[PDB]
């Protein structure tokens, strides 16, 4: 047969992300002395649309502690953040929406966003519109914090890891139907080349494992082993169960 569309994506020729119009990488500040020991104050200059992103971004200006200079940061805007708002980041920062605090400095039940998986990676968790991380609890003896991720998973992170207080702005986006192929066209026109999708069952056996037949049908179980190889993993990979989800999980 032929190399399938799953496998053609890794080469990344026509499958790279369309990034001309993007407004920069959304990151927290580099963890420095001011954030480790006290707090630093910045001012929100802009709240802008980032193409390919549902969440707006905030452009926040900070002073450089060591040279006469201004540092502009690209944060993910939490909902309620406004232009001209003062943002405080550090260990001694107060519990206000938009402030960047270590996870250990936030009491249980604190809603936080753009949370660091590891100390100083500048944000990994809860970055999409309407999403957040709930702080479940602390283990001060081991310097660890238990959090709940948007997927429902519980994670243990260093208490020195940082997050931004509040919920990511732009939520409820999925509530509206797209209603049109053109709307999805414009949605992925500034994301990447993954739309539209031809069904593999509608191809020929060269093109896909589902192709061929005198009727369109998969023919074998569409649940595929985790240990299958590239060119085989088309369908439901390592599926623990299938069918309509009935009852609680």
């Amino acid at each position: 047969g032929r190399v399938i569309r799953n496998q053609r994506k890794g080469a990344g020729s026509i499958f790279t992300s369309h990034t001309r119009l993007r407004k920069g990488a959304a990151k927290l500040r580099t963890l420095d002395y001011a954030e480790r020991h006290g707090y630093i104050r910045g001012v929100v200059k802009q709240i802008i649309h980032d193409p390919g992103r549902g969440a707006p971004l905030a452009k926040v200006a900070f002073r450089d502690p060591y040279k006469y200079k201004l540092r502009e940061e690209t944060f993910i805007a939490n909902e309620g953040v406004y232009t001209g708002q003062f943002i405080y980041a550090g260990k001694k920062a107060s519990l206000n929406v938009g402030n960047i605090l270590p996870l250990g400095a936030c009491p249980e039940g604190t809603i936080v966003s753009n949370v660091e998986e590891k100390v100083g990676d500048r944000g990994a968790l809860g970055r999409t519109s309407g999403n957040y991380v709930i702080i479940i609890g602390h283990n001060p003896d081991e310097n660890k914090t238990r959090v709940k991720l948007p997927s429902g998973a519980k994670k243990i992170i260093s208490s020195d890891a940082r997050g931004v207080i509040g919920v990511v702005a732009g939520g409820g986006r999925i509530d509206k139907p797209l209603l049109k192929a053109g709307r999805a066209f414009h949605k992925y026109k500034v994301k990447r080349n993954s739309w539209p999708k031809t069904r593999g069952v509608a191809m020929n056996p060269v093109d896909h494992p589902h192709g061929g037949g005198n009727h369109q049908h998969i023919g074998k179980a569409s649940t595929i082993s985790r240990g299958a190889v590239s060119g085989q993993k088309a369908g439901l990979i390592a599926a623990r169960r299938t069918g309509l989800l009935r009852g609680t999980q």
Binding site: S94, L95, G109, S129, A169, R173, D175, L179
Partner: protein, 91 residues
């Protein structure tokens, strides 16, 4: 006169896409095209730019909000939760 009985702003879609999808669109699109009261200057001059961006024509304040409303219920709940935990922490 009243021009449409029920489609309203969704009368631009004609007969396409299904009635359930069109009334579901109508609910959120009246909200995304409405004018909201500015919490800064007090005028009802706040309109959406892109999703999550709500600008006031008068005082030129931009606030991060929801996709189709200035404030979501989840954000209001988080605002009160944070206010409460701040009060307890600072006594």
């Amino acid at each position: 006169t009243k021009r449409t009985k029920k489609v309203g702003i969704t009368g631009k879609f004609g007969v396409r896409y299904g009635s359930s999808l069109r009334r579901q669109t109508k609910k959120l699109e009246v909200q995304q095209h409405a004018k909201y009261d500015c919490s800064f200057c007090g005028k009802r001059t706040v309109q959406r730019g892109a999703t999550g961006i709500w600008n006031c024509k008068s005082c030129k304040k931009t606030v991060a909000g929801g996709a189709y409303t200035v404030s979501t219920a989840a954000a209001a709940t988080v605002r009160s939760t944070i206010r409460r935990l701040r009060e307890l922490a600072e006594a």
